[PDB]
Ligand SMILES: *[C@@H]1O[C@H](CO[C@@H]2O[C@@H](C)[C@@H](O)[C@@H](O)[C@@H]2O)[C@@H](O[C@@H]2O[C@H](CO)[C@@H](O[C@@H]3O[C@H](CO[C@H]4O[C@H](CO)[C@@H](O)[C@H](O)[C@@H]4O)[C@@H](O)[C@H](O[C@H]4O[C@H](CO)[C@@H](O)[C@H](O)[C@@H]4O)[C@@H]3O)[C@H](O)[C@H]2NC(C)=O)[C@H](O)[C@H]1NC(C)=O
Ligand SMILES: CCCCCCCCCCCCCCCCCCCCCCCCCC(=O)N[C@@H](CO[C@H]1O[C@H](CO)[C@H](O)[C@H](O)[C@H]1O)[C@H](O)[C@H](O)CCCC(=O)Nc1ccc(CCCCC)cc1
Ligand SMILES: *[C@@H]1O[C@H](CO)[C@@H](O)[C@H](O)[C@H]1NC(C)=O
Ligand SMILES: *[C@@H]1O[C@H](CO)[C@@H](O)[C@H](O)[C@H]1NC(C)=O
Ligand code: NA
């Protein structure tokens with residue numbers, strides 16, 4: 001399963017200041033960025049155009065260029081109409097894309113909270129969303145041409161584009177990078193640090209011989225800047241009884257040869 | 264409004280005198296406007312690279328800062344964050360192991 005996510009973040013500070021910035025992810029790899037300051041969408045991989053021709057890409061990009069200007073104007077017009085009841089500053093986030101097996105999604109958040117989705121043939125407010133959104137959504141839903149474009153983008157364009165990314169980006173998407181591990185500590189806490197692995201699935205455990213130590217607490221997966229992962233696993237032990245312990249790491253990149261680090 | 268969490272960790276095993284990369288991962292904040300510096304002995308490090316800001320499933324923002332560094336037993340490193348959710352800048356020191 002790969003999830004393709006287009007993430008838009010728009011900040012409106014006052015009537016004279018706003019910006020919209022986007023990033024696109026295929027799974028955990030960034031494929032595009034679109035800065036407010038750029039007229040065009042930037043590739044972050046050599047395969048970010050997928051299997052689309054230069055012509056096809058310019059057209060799709062054009063549709064997003066029109067969208068970005070239209071969206072910014074629509075929000076500004078909406079705030080003028082609602083003032084002073086709804087007023088600056090405003091953060092709007094959009095998360096749109098598809099999960100491949102496909103199913104697509106388009107979710108919108110206002111001030112950090114999920115409020116609107118596109119679903120089926122229309123936009124809808126989610127239960128609990130502020131009631132002032134109902135009228136603008138009703139008005140947006142009268143725009144048949146926008147509805148048709150969004151339905152096309154979600155139902156058709158997205159899975160087609162992503163199938164092309166998966167083939168064009170195959171060697172990157174299926175890359176294997178090996179972890180390196182190290183041990184530390186400051187009744188003690190032993191920490192096994194594991195860094196530089198790709199892809200994300202990994203197994204890290206404190207061991208005494210062949211016995212898994214069940215007190216092992218796995219941390220959060222933290223990103224490195226080079227499209228690899230960092231993780232630590234900790235074990236709180238009795239002082240004196242640290243000898244005989246080892247950290248064991250299993251990962252797809254190691255070819256069945258686990259890392260074992262003895263304390 | 265959500266307060267940033269800060270984690271500071273090295274790319275490679277920290278060995279004194281060997282060049283390495285120090286990461287500052289800042290997460291779980293809203294609104295997205297934020298100021299992030301990395302410090303060596305309390306002084307701002309000049310060349311700090313920043314990822315594009317992005318956000319998680321829960322809509323909270325995150326961003327990764329990193330910088331080249333050479334650990335030694337005479338230098339401290341930290342990550343300092345200014346955000347509207349906090350009255351004063353929050354500083355997290357590299358614990359020398361991460
Ligand atoms: C794109 O795909 C849409 C479905 O996919 C979902 O939404 C997209 C955006 C993605 O996120 C995807 O991952 C999602 O899974 C698809 O939407 C569907 O469109 C049809 C019409 O084109 C809708 O059919 C109408 O259904 C209603 C009943 O709806 C309710 O009940 C059903 C279950 O019974 C639920 O699923 C719904 O959620 C509702 O609760 C009927 O009353 C209606 O009948 C009337 O109209 C037809 C003609 O269309 C006449 O023949 C009849 O006599 C009636 O007069 C329709 O049958 C369907 O509800 C809708 N799905 C959803 C989930 O809303 C969309 O059409 C696709 N667009 C394109 C361009 O491909
Ligand atoms: C998406 C699938 C991805 C496919 C993958 C391919 C790879 C692409 C790589 C992506 C890189 C960039 C990613 C950027 C992220 C954006 C993703 C989301 C896009 C979804 C919206 C697309 C809309 C496209 C249609 C459009 O542009 N409509 C125009 C102009 O309409 C006119 O012109 C049309 C043709 O050009 C039609 O003829 C139409 O009939 C005309 O009217 C409209 O002005 C519309 O309104 C404009 C506003 C619409 C709107 O998002 N509104 C909105 C949504 C939610 C809220 C509620 C919140 C509020 C809280 C206060 C409020 C407003
Ligand atoms: C609007 O917000 C921007 C960004 O914070 C600020 O620099 C500017 O002074 C503000 N303008 C007005 C007219 O308040
Ligand atoms: C963002 O881009 C738009 C369109 O070019 C521009 O009008 C706006 O001033 C930009 N905002 C900032 C804060 O640079
Ligand atoms: Na949706």
Ligand code: NA
Pocket residue numbers: 091092093109110111112113
């Ligand atoms: Na938001």
